[PDB]
From a paper:
HG3.17 was evolved from HG3, a higher-activity mutant (S265T) of the in silico design HG2 that was engineered post-design to reduce the active-site conformational heterogeneity observed by molecular dynamics analysis of HG25. Over an evolutionary trajectory that yielded the HG3.3b, HG3.7, and HG3.14 intermediates, a total of 17 mutations were introduced into HG3 to produce HG3.17, resulting in a catalytic efficiency increase of approximately three orders of magnitude. To evaluate changes to the HG3 conformational ensemble along its evolutionary trajectory, we solved room-temperature (277 K) X-ray crystal structures of all HG-series Kemp eliminases, both in the presence and absence of bound 6NT.
In all enzymes except for HG3.17, the unbound state is never pre-organized for catalysis as both Trp44 and Met237 adopt conformations that would prevent productive binding of 6NT. From HG3 to HG3.14, the unbound state is never pre-organized for catalysis as both Trp44 and Met237 adopt conformations that would prevent the productive binding of the transition state. From HG3.7 to HG3.17, no further changes in catalytic residues occurred during evolution. Yet, catalytic efficiency increased by approximately fivefold.
Numbering used by the authors:
A (entry chain B), B (entry chain A): 4 to 303
C-alpha cells in the first residue's frame, strides 16, 4: 500500500520524500515515488550554493528538472531553503554592507520564488536560525542586518508568491524539554503577533534510535506557536525501528495542524548516513519492516 | 585491494568511475572512490542540458564541485560529452541557420574547456554520432551543418585546451562483426588522415550477460583505426558475472593503446538498470565476486 494514500485518508496532506534528477533516472526511485509518495522536495538543487554560486549567476537546470517531473506526475512540490547559513556560498558571507546584504537576500528569494510562482506548495524561507540554547544564531544575516532579517525574508517571500506556505525550519526540535524547542515557539508567536507571515514551522528530524517517542510531546509544543501548519522535514531514524517510525507518524496524526511528513530519501544506500540504515526501503528497494508498520498503523 | 593501483602496475593509466556531488555526499561512494579508483567522470554535471540550459548562459556549480573534489583527492578527471544529441536542450535543436549553429557549438565547447583548462585528462567531444547501420546519425548538427560538424568540433576543442586528449564515443561497438564497429573505424581513419585531432575512441560499453567474450575481438578492431588511445567507458554488465568482467579487463590489457576502464557507478542501487545488478559493489557497498575476480586477474 501507498503510505501517501493512507495518510491522506486520515486527513493529512502528504507523505513526501526528498529527491533530485539523478535519483529519478537511477534505481527504482521514480517507480516508488509515483506509487507511494505524494510530494517531492529537492535534496540539494534549490540550496543557495547550488542555485546562485556566484552573484547573479543562477543555476536552475536541476531544480527545473524536478519541478517538471513533479508536475507531469501529479505530485506536490516543497522547496528550500532560501536563507540557511550551511549552504551559503562564500561570496555572500563576505558581504559586510547592510543595504547590500538585504538586497542580495531579497534578490535571491524573489528570483527563485518568481521562477516557480504558483507551482510550489511549501517554501522553507529561513533555516537553522537558532542556537541550541535558544538564542539567535550569529550567521552573516544576523551579524550584518540584525534580527529584522527574519521579518524581511518572510515579507519578501510573501510578496513574491502569495500562494506558497512560508515556513521557518530548524533541527533538534525533537524534545519538549530542550531550550531550542521552547525558544522557537516563543519567537514565532511574537513574530506572528507583529504581522510577520510565518505559515509554518518545519522540524528537520534526524533521529537516533529510541527518539521517536519524544516527538509525541515535542510536536504539540511546536504547534502551540499558533502557525497554521507544522510539518516534519527530511526525517530519518538510525536503525529504522518500526517503533520509532510509528511514533513519529502518530505524533503527526495527533497534531491537527501537522500537514504531513517528508522522509530524507527512498533507499538506505542513498542516505547521507547509509551505515545507520535509516530509511524505509533497503538496498534492494524492498520495503523494510518500518514501512509495513506505518501502513498497518494508518489502516487502523 | 585497489583495482586502480593494480591496473597501473600492469602499465595502464586508470580504473575510473562516474560520480557527481550528491553521490560523494551519500552512501560510501567517496570512501570507495578514494581507496579504489584513479579517475572520476561527471555522471551528468557536464552534459549540455546541465551546463548551458539557455544560450550563452552557463551552469557550473555541479561540475566545479566534482573538479575540486578530484583535485583535492589526487584523482584524474575525464569529462563529457560536449556534442551529443541525447542531452541537448530544446533551444539548440530549433536552430536552423548553419553559421549560427556552428557559433553556438564552438562557444559551448570553448567555454567549458577553457574553464577547466589543464585540469581534465580526457574530453569526450562528440558522442553517439553513428546509426546502427554505420551511417551518420541525423541529429541537428548533421542536418544543419553537415558532416563537417565533427571536424569543426575537434579542431575547436584542440585549440581550447591542447593538453586534453580528445575522444569520440559510441555504444554497441562490442562485436567485431557488427556494422557500427567497422564504420567508426573507417570514418576515424579518414578523419585522422585529414588532420582532425581525434586522440581516442571511447567504447560506451553496456553489456548483456555473456557479451564480455566478444570484446576481446572488438577492442583490437577499434584500435586498428590508429588513434593514440582507446578506452572502455561507462561500463556495466547485466548480472555482473566474473567471467564477463574479467574478459573486458583482459581485452584492455591485450590492446596496447587502451589506457583504462571507467565503470558506470559504484553500487548496484545507483545504476540506471539496478534490477540487472550490473556493477562491482552491492547495495550494502560490499565488493561483489566480479570485483575480487578482477583483483586476482590483475595480480596473475
Amino acid at each position: 500500500q501507498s503510505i501517501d494514500q493512507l495518510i491522506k485518508a486520515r486527513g493529512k496532506v502528504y507523505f513526501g520524500v526528498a529527491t533530485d534528477q539523478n535519483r529519478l533516472t537511477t534505481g527504482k526511485n521514480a517507480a516508488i515515488i509515483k506509487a507511494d509518495f505524494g510530494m517531492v522536495w529537492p535534496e540539494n538543487s534549490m540550496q543557495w550554493d547550488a542555485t546562485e554560486p556566484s552573484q547573479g549567476n543562477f543555476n536552475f537546470a536541476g531544480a527545473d528538472y524536478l519541478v517538471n517531473w513533479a508536475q507531469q506526475n501529479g505530485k506536490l512540490i516543497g522547496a528550500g531553503c532560501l536563507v540557511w547559513h550551511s549552504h551559503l556560498p562564500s561570496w555572500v558571507s563576505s558581504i559586510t554592507d547592510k543595504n547590500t546584504l538585504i538586497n542580495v537576500m531579497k534578490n535571491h528569494i524573489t528570483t527563485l520564488m518568481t521562477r516557480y510562482k504558483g507551482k510550489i506548495r511549501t517554501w522553507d524561507v529561513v533555516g537553522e536560525a537558532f542556537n541550541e540554547d535558544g538564542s539567535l544564531r550569529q550567521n552573516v544575516f544576523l551579524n550584518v542586518i540584525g534580527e529584522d532579517y527574519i521579518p524581511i525574508a518572510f515579507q519578501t517571500a510573501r510578496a513574491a508568491d502569495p500562494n506558497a506556505k512560508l515556513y521557518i525550519m530548524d533541527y533538534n526540535l525533537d524534545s519538549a524539554s530542550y531550550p531550542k524547542t521552547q525558544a522557537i515557539v516563543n519567537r514565532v508567536k511574537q513574530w506572528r503577533a507583529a504581522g510577520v507571515p510565518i505559515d509554518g514551522i518545519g522540524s528537520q528530524m534526524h533521529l537516533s534510535a529510541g527518539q521517536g517517542a519524544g516527538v509525541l510531546q515535542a510536536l504539540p509544543l511546536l504547534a502551540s506557536a499558533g502557525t497554521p501548519e507544522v510539518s516534519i522535514l527530511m526525517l530519518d531514524v538510525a536503525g529504522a525501528s518500526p517503533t520509532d517510525y510509528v511514533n513519529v507518524v502518530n505524533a503527526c496524526l495527533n497534531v491537527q495542524s501537522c500537514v504531513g511528513i517528508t522522509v530524507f530519501g527512498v533507499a538506505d544506500p542513498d542516505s547521507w548516513r547509509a551505515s545507520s540504515t535509516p530509511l524505509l526501503f533497503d538496498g534492494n528497494f524492498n520495503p523494510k519492516p518500518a514501512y509495513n508498520a506505518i501502513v498497518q498503523n494508518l489502516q487502523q
